[PDB]
Design a protein around this ligand. Structure first.
Ligand SMILES: CN(C)c1nc(CC[C@H]2CCN(c3ccccn3)C2)nc2ccc(Cl)cc12
Ligand SMILES: [Mg+2]
Ligand SMILES: [Zn+2]
Length: 313
């Protein structure tokens, strides 16, 4: 009740900034998350014992893969925390509750392989869920953990409020399928530019939350350059293992998954920043002006990849 979480001074200040890195001490990550829920949502949002039990079962259901691991989950939740704290009055009580949970759960039980690889392997999940294959699995694992004894963090919500928060979570998790982002951002671009964007329209709020989810999921491109560059190593460790598995199925992988083509990483990152990252944070900054530091840090990192190519690093 009167039991606040407090962080050391450096973390207490820097956790408020978009570019915060949660650090290599895994045992501090639960406390960092609870800290963020208490300031973002309130100390009354969740029963501490249930929230702590939920966080630890979530952790246990992330795998020891190079990138789509527990550290990614907490990192994506912190980017959402920073967006929510910079946009105090724009979000509902239920949205504040739902979105940090959605971010912590958005990659539950990821194996380090894309939807394409599951479909080419003919994995059972690809027959259960024909599109957004891993994202439907991540939502299925979130409902499983919510239903374990002593893990219903939403127990005090009415039936209809409980259904609404699980619907915010389902949409926020599905929206992390990058295949869905391209069309979502185009519609948001048209809506903002013809002045039709309306934050009282539920279907429009859903689009804006979807874009927030892409922005938080891609937030490694918005860190300080040494964090961005070292994270890229983990991202490629997975891509290249997937390429190896494609080659075992007798399929030449695309170049971003082929370790024989490491030399092309700098130009590949360039395309990604130009086609995905910069557009994402540009549209987000137009809808939510106080998120501009994400766009600025992305532009800084695009310019670092240009330097890599020019042989200045
Ligand atoms: C979101 N996710 C799919 C991401 N995909 C890529 C790959 C771009 C790829 C486009 C081309 N590609 C190549 C091509 C040849 C050799 C090497 N790479 C990289 N880079 C990312 C970086 C940061 C984050 Cl946070 C997410 C991603
Ligand atoms: Mg994912
Ligand atoms: Zn993710």
């Amino acid at each position: 009740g009167l039991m606040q979480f407090t962080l050391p001074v450096r973390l207490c200040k820097e956790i408020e900034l978009f570019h915060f890195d949660i650090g290599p001490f895994e045992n501090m990550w639960p406390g960092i998350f609870v800290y963020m829920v208490h300031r973002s949502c309130g100390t009354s949002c969740f029963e501490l014992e249930k929230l702590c039990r939920f966080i630890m079962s979530v952790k246990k259901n992330y795998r020891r893969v190079p990138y789509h691991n527990w550290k990614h989950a907490v990192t994506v939740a912190h980017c959402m925390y920073a967006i929510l704290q910079n946009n105090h009055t724009l979000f509902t009580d239920l949205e504040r509750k739902g979105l940090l949970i959605a971010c912590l759960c958005h990659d539950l039980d990821h194996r380090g392989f894309s939807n394409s690889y599951l479909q080419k392997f003919d994995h059972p999940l690809a027959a259960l869920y024909s599109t957004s294959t891993m994202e439907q699995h991540h939502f299925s694992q979130t409902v499983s953990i919510l239903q374990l004894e002593g893990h219903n963090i939403f127990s005090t919500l009415s039936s209809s409020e409980y259904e609404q928060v699980l619907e915010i979570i389902r949409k926020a998790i599905i929206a992390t399928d990058l295949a869905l982002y391209f069309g979502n951002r185009k519609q948001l671009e048209e809506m903002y530019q013809t002045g039709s964007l309306n934050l009282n329209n539920q279907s429009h709020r859903d689009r804006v939350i979807g874009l927030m989810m892409t922005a938080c999921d891609l937030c490694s491109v918005t860190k300080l350059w040494p964090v961005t560059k070292l994270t890229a190593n983990d991202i490629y460790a997975e891509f290249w293992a997937e390429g190896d598995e494609m080659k075992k199925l007798g399929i030449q992988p695309i170049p971003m998954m082929d370790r024989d083509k490491k030399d092309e990483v700098p130009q590949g990152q360039l395309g990604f920043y130009n086609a995905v990252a910069i557009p994402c944070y540009t549209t987000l900054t137009q809808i939510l002006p106080p998120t501009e530091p994400l766009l600025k840090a992305c532009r800084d990192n695009l310019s670092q990849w240009e330097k890599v190519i020019r042989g200045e690093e």
